[PDB]
Amino acid sequence: STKKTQLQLEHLLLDLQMILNGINNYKNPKLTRMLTFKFYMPKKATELKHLQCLEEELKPLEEVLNLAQNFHLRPRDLISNINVIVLELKGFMCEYADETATIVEFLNRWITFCQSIISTLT
């Protein structure tokens, strides 16, 4: 059971890295515009339940990705896969930090979240 959970988190981790890697490959003028969009961050993220904070930001994430545009998956598909994993993992009202972050900082934070939880299940 713990193994199934770890594997789901690992897939979420790779999914998030794929978005970040794709975004890092945008041309700079484009990336500069993309970095103006505000994302909301969890005050605290240490347990699966905290994934609610990620779930609520999936819509704006998909919108921004759609607005952007070589991605080997359509944003709707990529976000759908992330959506499924998040829904199955968190099975609480998300507390957000005052400061917003760019899409890059937001992805990093959630990538870090996954890596941290994965390491408690090894």
Side-chain angles (χ1 to χ4, degrees), residues 1-73 75-122:
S1 193
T2 271
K3 285 303 191 183
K4 165 191 168 186
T5 291
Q6 192 186 39
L7 188 50
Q8 286 174 296
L9 285 163
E10 296 177 343
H11 276 273
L12 175 58
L13 169 56
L14 282 154
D15 285 348
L16 294 167
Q17 293 178 137
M18 183 179 323
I19 301 190
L20 176 63
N21 293 334
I23 288 170
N24 283 341
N25 273 252
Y26 285 170
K27 268 181 258 289
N28 295 322
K30 182 179 196 175
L31 186 44
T32 292
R33 292 187 312 258
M34 300 297 294
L35 292 169
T36 69
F37 299 118
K38 288 189 188 183
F39 285 84
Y40 293 81
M41 311 280 273
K43 184 182 195 188
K44 185 192 173 190
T46 55
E47 313 182 359
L48 297 172
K49 75 179 180 183
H50 295 137
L51 278 168
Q52 177 75 22
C53 293
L54 174 55
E55 183 192 356
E56 292 173 13
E57 288 298 279
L58 291 180
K59 282 170 189 182
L61 178 59
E62 177 178 354
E63 181 58 49
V64 171
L65 291 181
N66 277 150
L67 295 177
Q69 289 343 328
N70 240 342
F71 212 50
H72 18 312
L73 290 187
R76 88 176 291 260
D77 292 322
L78 198 14
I79 302 303
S80 277
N81 184 34
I82 286 172
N83 207 158
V84 170
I85 299 170
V86 169
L87 288 177
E88 297 184 345
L89 277 173
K90 62 94 162 179
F92 172 92
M93 289 172 305
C94 174
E95 211 166 328
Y96 291 96
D98 274 277
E99 299 285 343
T100 51
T102 69
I103 184 172
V104 168
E105 314 176 304
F106 165 85
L107 290 167
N108 283 150
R109 180 70 189 85
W110 285 112
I111 281 159
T112 293
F113 170 79
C114 294
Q115 300 186 126
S116 288
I117 306 308
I118 288 170
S119 286
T120 73
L121 307 168
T122 288

